[PDB]
Design an enzyme around this catalytic site. Sequence first.
Site, PDB file in Angstrom:
ATOM      1  N   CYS A 242      -5.681  -1.112   5.591  1.00 32.93           N
ATOM      2  CA  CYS A 242      -6.037  -1.431   6.960  1.00 32.93           C
ATOM      3  C   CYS A 242      -7.152  -0.484   7.399  1.00 32.93           C
ATOM      4  O   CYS A 242      -7.056   0.208   8.419  1.00 32.93           O
ATOM      5  CB  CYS A 242      -4.839  -1.330   7.883  1.00 32.93           C
ATOM      6  SG  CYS A 242      -4.218   0.316   7.970  1.00 32.93           S
TER       7      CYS A 242
ATOM      8  N   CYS B 179      -0.190   4.522   5.743  1.00 35.53           N
ATOM      9  CA  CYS B 179      -0.107   4.326   7.178  1.00 35.53           C
ATOM     10  C   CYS B 179       1.188   4.853   7.788  1.00 35.53           C
ATOM     11  O   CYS B 179       1.157   5.526   8.821  1.00 35.53           O
ATOM     12  CB  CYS B 179      -0.210   2.851   7.497  1.00 35.53           C
ATOM     13  SG  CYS B 179      -1.877   2.397   7.906  1.00 35.53           S
TER      14      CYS B 179
ATOM     15  N   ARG C 168      -0.673  -5.076  10.706  1.00 33.28           N
ATOM     16  CA  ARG C 168       0.756  -4.838  10.517  1.00 33.28           C
ATOM     17  C   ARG C 168       1.514  -4.565  11.824  1.00 33.28           C
ATOM     18  O   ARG C 168       2.721  -4.394  11.797  1.00 33.28           O
ATOM     19  CB  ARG C 168       0.997  -3.701   9.507  1.00 33.28           C
ATOM     20  CG  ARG C 168       0.688  -4.116   8.031  1.00 33.28           C
ATOM     21  CD  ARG C 168       0.280  -2.951   7.096  1.00 33.28           C
ATOM     22  NE  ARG C 168      -0.192  -3.522   5.826  1.00 33.28           N
ATOM     23  CZ  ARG C 168      -1.429  -3.970   5.643  1.00 33.28           C
ATOM     24  NH1 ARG C 168      -2.327  -3.845   6.617  1.00 33.28           N
ATOM     25  NH2 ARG C 168      -1.773  -4.542   4.490  1.00 33.28           N
TER      26      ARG C 168
ATOM     27  N   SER D 249       3.656   0.489  10.445  1.00 33.67           N
ATOM     28  CA  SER D 249       4.641   0.647   9.382  1.00 33.67           C
ATOM     29  C   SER D 249       5.562   1.845   9.651  1.00 33.67           C
ATOM     30  O   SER D 249       6.604   1.961   9.018  1.00 33.67           O
ATOM     31  CB  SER D 249       4.013   0.738   7.995  1.00 33.67           C
ATOM     32  OG  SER D 249       3.444  -0.512   7.612  1.00 33.67           O
TER      33      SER D 249
ATOM     34  N   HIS E 257      -7.486   2.485  12.095  1.00 34.36           N
ATOM     35  CA  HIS E 257      -7.361   3.851  12.585  1.00 34.36           C
ATOM     36  C   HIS E 257      -8.671   4.338  13.177  1.00 34.36           C
ATOM     37  O   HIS E 257      -8.664   5.128  14.118  1.00 34.36           O
ATOM     38  CB  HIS E 257      -6.862   4.782  11.482  1.00 34.36           C
ATOM     39  CG  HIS E 257      -5.487   4.448  11.023  1.00 34.36           C
ATOM     40  ND1 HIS E 257      -4.369   4.755  11.771  1.00 34.36           N
ATOM     41  CD2 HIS E 257      -5.041   3.790   9.928  1.00 34.36           C
ATOM     42  CE1 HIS E 257      -3.290   4.305  11.151  1.00 34.36           C
ATOM     43  NE2 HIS E 257      -3.671   3.716  10.030  1.00 34.36           N
TER      44      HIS E 257
ATOM     45  N   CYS F 207       2.805  -0.589   4.547  1.00 27.86           N
ATOM     46  CA  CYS F 207       1.715   0.307   4.237  1.00 27.86           C
ATOM     47  C   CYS F 207       2.190   1.734   4.427  1.00 27.86           C
ATOM     48  O   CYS F 207       2.293   2.186   5.550  1.00 27.86           O
ATOM     49  CB  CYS F 207       0.559   0.072   5.175  1.00 27.86           C
ATOM     50  SG  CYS F 207      -0.801   0.987   4.478  1.00 27.86           S
TER      51      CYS F 207
ATOM     52  N   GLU G 162       0.852  -1.182   0.000  1.00 31.77           N
ATOM     53  CA  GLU G 162       0.000   0.000   0.000  1.00 31.77           C
ATOM     54  C   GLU G 162       0.886   1.230   0.000  1.00 31.77           C
ATOM     55  O   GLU G 162       1.801   1.345   0.826  1.00 31.77           O
ATOM     56  CB  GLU G 162      -0.872   0.041   1.251  1.00 31.77           C
ATOM     57  CG  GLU G 162      -1.966   1.109   1.252  1.00 31.77           C
ATOM     58  CD  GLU G 162      -1.466   2.550   1.318  1.00 31.77           C
ATOM     59  OE1 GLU G 162      -0.497   2.823   2.081  1.00 31.77           O
ATOM     60  OE2 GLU G 162      -2.029   3.405   0.581  1.00 31.77           O
TER      61      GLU G 162
ATOM     62  N   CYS H 146      -5.644   5.147   6.018  1.00 30.38           N
ATOM     63  CA  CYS H 146      -5.474   4.023   5.123  1.00 30.38           C
ATOM     64  C   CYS H 146      -6.730   3.208   4.850  1.00 30.38           C
ATOM     65  O   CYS H 146      -7.523   2.923   5.752  1.00 30.38           O
ATOM     66  CB  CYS H 146      -4.372   3.128   5.647  1.00 30.38           C
ATOM     67  SG  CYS H 146      -3.983   1.841   4.503  1.00 30.38           S
TER      68      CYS H 146
HETATM   69  N1  NFU Z   1      -2.305  -2.791   9.599  1.00 31.44           N
HETATM   70  C1  NFU Z   1      -2.116  -1.691   9.282  1.00 31.44           C
HETATM   71 FE1  NFU Z   1      -1.924   0.114   8.753  1.00 31.44          FE
HETATM   72 NI1  NFU Z   1      -2.481   0.614   6.189  1.00 31.44          NI
HETATM   73  C2  NFU Z   1       0.016  -0.031   8.972  1.00 31.44           C
HETATM   74  N2  NFU Z   1       1.040   0.011   8.988  1.00 31.44           N
HETATM   75  C3  NFU Z   1      -2.228   0.531  10.504  1.00 31.44           C
HETATM   76  O1  NFU Z   1      -2.407   0.814  11.547  1.00 31.44           O
END
Ligand code: NFU
Lengths: 551, 551, 268, 268
Positions: A63, A548, A478, A501, A67, A545, A13, A60
């Site tokens: 995921c 993220c 993640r 991430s 959030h 990600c 991502e 994001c």
């Molecule tokens: N899982 C996930 Fe995200 Ni697109 C990350 N890094 C999160 O909080």
Amino acid sequence: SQRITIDPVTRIEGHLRIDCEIENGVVSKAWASGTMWRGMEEIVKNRDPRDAWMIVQRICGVCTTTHAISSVRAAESALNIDVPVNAQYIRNIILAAHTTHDHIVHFYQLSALDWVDITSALKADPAKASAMLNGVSTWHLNSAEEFTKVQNKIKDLVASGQLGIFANGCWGHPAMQLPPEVNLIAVAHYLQALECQRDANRVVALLGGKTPHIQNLAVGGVANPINLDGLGVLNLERLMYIKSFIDKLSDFVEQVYKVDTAVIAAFYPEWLERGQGAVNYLSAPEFPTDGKNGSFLFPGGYITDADLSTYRPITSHSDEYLIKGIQESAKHAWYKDEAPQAPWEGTTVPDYTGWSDDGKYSWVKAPTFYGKTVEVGPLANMLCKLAAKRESTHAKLNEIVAIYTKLTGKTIEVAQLHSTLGRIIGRTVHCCELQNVLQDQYNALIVNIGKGDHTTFVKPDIPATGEFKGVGFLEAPRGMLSHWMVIKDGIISNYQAVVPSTWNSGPRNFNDEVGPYERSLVGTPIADPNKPLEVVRTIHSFDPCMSCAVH
Amino acid sequence: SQRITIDPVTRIEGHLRIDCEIENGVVSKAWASGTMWRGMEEIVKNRDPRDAWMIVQRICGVCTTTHAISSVRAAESALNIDVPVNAQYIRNIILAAHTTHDHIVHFYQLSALDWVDITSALKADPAKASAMLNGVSTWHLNSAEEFTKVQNKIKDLVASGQLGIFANGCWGHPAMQLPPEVNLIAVAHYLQALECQRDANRVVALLGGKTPHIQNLAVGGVANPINLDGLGVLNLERLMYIKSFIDKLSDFVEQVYKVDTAVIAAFYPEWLERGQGAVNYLSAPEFPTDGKNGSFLFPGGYITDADLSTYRPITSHSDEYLIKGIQESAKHAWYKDEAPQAPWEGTTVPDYTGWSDDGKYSWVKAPTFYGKTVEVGPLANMLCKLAAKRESTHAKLNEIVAIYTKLTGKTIEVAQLHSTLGRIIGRTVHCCELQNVLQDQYNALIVNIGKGDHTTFVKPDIPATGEFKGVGFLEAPRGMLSHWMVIKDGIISNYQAVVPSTWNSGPRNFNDEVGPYERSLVGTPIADPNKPLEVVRTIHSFDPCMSCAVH
Amino acid sequence: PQRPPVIWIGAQECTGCTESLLRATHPTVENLVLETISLEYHEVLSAAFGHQVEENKHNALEKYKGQYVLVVDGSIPLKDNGIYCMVAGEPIVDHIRRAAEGAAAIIAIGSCAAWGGVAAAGVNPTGAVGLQEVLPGKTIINIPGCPPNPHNFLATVAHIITYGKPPKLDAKNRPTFAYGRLIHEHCERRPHFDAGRFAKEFGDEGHREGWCLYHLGCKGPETYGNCSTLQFCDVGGVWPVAIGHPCYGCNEEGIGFHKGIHQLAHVE
Amino acid sequence: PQRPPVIWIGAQECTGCTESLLRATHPTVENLVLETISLEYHEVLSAAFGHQVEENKHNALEKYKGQYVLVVDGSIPLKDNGIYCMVAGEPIVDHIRRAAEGAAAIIAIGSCAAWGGVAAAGVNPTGAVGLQEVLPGKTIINIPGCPPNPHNFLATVAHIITYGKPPKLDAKNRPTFAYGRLIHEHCERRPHFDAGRFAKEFGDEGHREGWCLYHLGCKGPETYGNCSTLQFCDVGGVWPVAIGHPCYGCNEEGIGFHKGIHQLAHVE
Ligand code: NFU
Ligand code: NFU
Ligand code: SF4
Ligand code: SF4
Ligand code: SF4
Ligand code: SF4
Ligand code: F3S
Ligand code: F3S
Ligand SMILES: [Mg+2]
Ligand SMILES: [Mg+2]
């Protein structure tokens, strides 16, 4: 010392650039760079604390949900709210079902084509491919006839001369080590995965109101109205529909995804021997089951020196040990303030200076926990659970190992989990254990409603004056996610997100220690510097990600 | 000598009683009795002609769709309405998708348990069963693993106290001739069929507004509003959804249903030699594609003396030849007026006299065509299409026969089609050809909308005075259906339905000739007169629907 | 584990209510009969026939006395001593009253069983009545519609199984989760109604914009049910009004099969 | 048989718009990419990475000049000369202007690409704008939402492929089939709105009866979309207010990410 850049890194991502120095066919030093910034932390500032989650969910859409839930938990933390247990059941089902979709897609759609050659799959004998799975899996879609239908779809794609998405991939690369037959098996599973992940999202949709981006939360609980006898609300018929999709997930996860990870490992055993990202690991406990934001189904904690004996459990999202340790540094990121900041005192002031190997090179901040760099994610969460002696986690890991053993005559020790494949394995274990979370939490909701409890919401009292600070932890697909909210005079005065991430893709920190992605790449063999499949393999294991990472 | 009654006959629609005299272990004589009557003809009477279709659709919920479309076609005939061609595409798509669901369910849920022993399936070797199908079918759900999962479901059902649906069936009966492996195969397919039939009805639902009992018809066309750019109406997105479900039908029909038909025939060769119900066959042409209620995709006609060379084609629903031939008699049914009646002059006044072997014994009327008893249904429709030299029908039949030949080393001549299995084969051939009807008509609808035609409805002119008569023909899943409406002074003065199962299940007629069910049973061997499975086998081949037969 | 027993008896039924089960998704009919209940008697589905299927019924009536839910579809014809529906040589009323005695709960599925339905419309030639009329001392759960969405039935059975009692019922003994509200009081076309945006004929401009169907004769204003929300077949967006045809009021006594399709809701 | 080429470029995107495709059912993503279109470039799904995938982009842009549909998700940051989104060492605004040159059609999917969306809200740190603002003189098809129902996009692409032209658009260049009407002018809770039946707080009596969510801050009255009809995920009955939460106005510039969740909408 040869220099390479991989920009963009695809099948993640968001926007990631990876640079490596290569010496004697092996990468000697690396840099990870998040190359897009939006400033989501500033965008939510100065608003009602209740509005944040709808905005900050848009950090994001991969995921999605994460959030959102972390944002409400942080406001709840600030305002001292006990979440209604029904609201926890609902949040839990959503998180677990989402993570199910997320891990499946990562293994298949995002990662498989690192290890799988589709051109080789054309040369396979479907009968042999099917036969080699006898007694390895009970999946009902491993027939020669299934594999042939899949092989013909590949043939026809190739025949059209429009490979699109699949064009110019690493077909024929020296690091592709699967036989034609297991290449075809994996492609058939790739396609089957898409059905499974759709079912997982139907669970999320029925509770969230849609996905991507759920819309059923609130600071204080959830917006689902529980009423068995109500028309147009969350009644028994709707709950049965939810259950119908929950029941469709387990078989693919257990009989395909779980088996394919042992199969991949069997053909790539040296990848259990490289790709270590860190010696320190952190995870939050997850899935609270009481009316006091605690009693988590999954334990969390902190491990240091790659030694499970050091395991320090974390069983509360209010644990001051966890809260006080977290800081972020922009010494090597494109922000103004460079000393490590506790997120409640965090700033995000852009200062783009362009690429410098020794200076600033990323939009990602570099987090530390009491000064140490730490890997987060399914590996971290697996190691913590093992160290906590969670029988379920040992049993599930051992199931994957047992398949690897049947295939290779070898075993996998805990030392080999600190690796690219170990990281992949942690994610598969997570996905497997989450199926029992879904069953348990559905049942708990059904029984709680039966006891007469239809409470879903506690009204926040947000004082018009005074300062309140809150932190919302969540163990995301993640890794450990945390949202840090400061409220002043009834509105958001500071908001900082520290995202998994961010931990893993973070650049060199305040003392110049490289982040997990950067550490993991050192030692990576390179057969062809113009086609650095081997770095992409390791980096994908972290499930990057970048929307993220940077927000 | 010995007299037996089967009451109720199960795995059909509605209420059917079958009596047989048995001599020397062979039935020598039979009676078919429809045991429930509602008086649907009387219920519609005196209403606006436009109201009829919603009421008489309720003649049946198994063959839902059929009476609704026949009813509007009858009103349209009476008022000389040319149906807008888009409304034809829509009616046809609905009829073909519904009939697809109908036939699948008949072969599996209604019929298979005549031929398949579930107790024997438990004894099967799943790997053996799967291996038998190699090169026989390309279906992707014939694996040993699939068959194992299916076998375990039955094991679990039997193991429990409660066989329910499957309790006290003809398990271990001497006429059960399948090996354990083929029983298991058939049970696996019984379960898979349920998914295919669900997809067929999703097509029906998206145009009909629901199923059972569609709600999108009108005298004058349909109530779907075609507008590619409209919100909430039949736009391109909705049409794409329809197409997604149409596309899901063909593999199971071609690779499972078509194949199982041949394997059943392979183990039951003598059933190609008994069960003949008639020497005369009638069907209506079907799926009009022009704007003048004609240009049918499927031809119809009349055949006498079991001889295809006698084929008199019928290519118009306003062909006087067909219209003038049809009469019904209650000489042996519980109605007052006994002489043969043309339906525009039909009456339906109850006269229940109880059971009498030589008198009246059914609520079903006995229809004739120019005084002759006639079988209707898929065998009739297949025979007519073969006689018409329709290459698609010959080709489809040949595919089934070839599978038979691969399995048996034997062949099937047209002579053998006049039988219980030939009738079953006709139904399978019909389901198979209908998939091309679905594709053809979907594409025709798409191209026509692109030419700018969005017309779906012409308002009917209904004269406040005067007499008008119309007949609506329809080739239903069980055979030729006809609704006969007389309008007098703006309202319905007479309404008569002559339904395919009326033709087949009708009792002795005015000239004392037995109906097709009654004829088909003569010669049937009986291993156990208390469990006459052999009778139930032949009767099921006609796909009885008694709410339809009697209405 | 042992599955709750169900006995299903069809009277004057078109079999549409049985067929609704074949569209169901939660549970699917195969999960219904293999996992959620034990279908002890059902003429449409049963392997056994004739004398063996009547053996199955008496055996189930005895073994599962006081534990089974009895379901009836179709109307019950009272005229001429029951002869208009006879199975195994006896009036269907008799089969039903015998089955009702050992019933833990009794459901009338479909408008016919709920209130006589189409079979009791017009001059009612067979003297068809609803199940409640046949079983006057028993509390009958009515689940009307022609046929209802199968989940109106399934979630009712699930409530009994899961929570040990029927769901909440309105004054007409219909589960409130499915029938507690008029279609018109929860219809997505209500804004067009409010604004006087009416389809006048099928295929007209208003019709092709998804406007309100009141003037095509929509019976939503006087019909209780969940057609606009639960809708049908679980594909999303399908019920009669959404596909372009007025509600005919099939759920509701005195509306469906009484009033003309194009008769307005305010017209008797 | 050659499939129509599509080039997908991600700017400041959260990937939710790409993710919406993984929920689609007509076509499913796998059918989309193997049968419906040829997806020539897509960062999230491409086997190739780095120099190789940028080769693929250059090749497709040349080969299919004047033939491909260009899709963009995410906002475009113009501040500080485009540096807030850099791929392959260049501002994304440059990749997008290059690809737009040889495009047969251009689609901005999602509110970010359509009008700036969340990324351009508040003080707009990166000077994010919508696709139309970066491509003046070009006709941009806007398919807003955060993310939209993927079929709002898929049926648009299908219209283009099947009938050779874009679907009918409103003044903001949104397809009328999906955006031609206020959610509130086709919402099933309108009867409750009319009667004064409102949820006042999540979990209250009215909320648990499925009453109107206007006073919880529903933005239905000022938001164009098809959320109440097409809804989401094709399972039936799933959209934010059906689930119990007000519309936030995510489709509509000036509404979503600008007004508070609980701030009241204007009603026409
Ligand atoms: N899982 C996930 Fe995200 Ni697109 C990350 N890094 C999160 O909080
Ligand atoms: N097919 C059918 Fe029905 Ni229930 C019969 N017979 C018919 O019109
Ligand atoms: S209610 Fe409608 S569906 Fe059920 S039996 Fe009566 S007529 Fe058939
Ligand atoms: S369509 Fe029927 S139910 Fe819907 S608003 Fe108009 S009249 Fe009322
Ligand atoms: S529109 Fe919503 S979903 Fe699409 S990118 Fe912008 S934020 Fe993510
Ligand atoms: S305010 Fe929202 S919920 Fe109420 S009617 Fe309007 S759109 Fe529906
Ligand atoms: S006629 Fe019947 S099914 Fe619903 S929409 Fe009207 S009540
Ligand atoms: S917030 Fe968005 S998805 Fe639809 S319901 Fe409201 S416009
Ligand atoms: Mg941050
Ligand atoms: Mg008749």
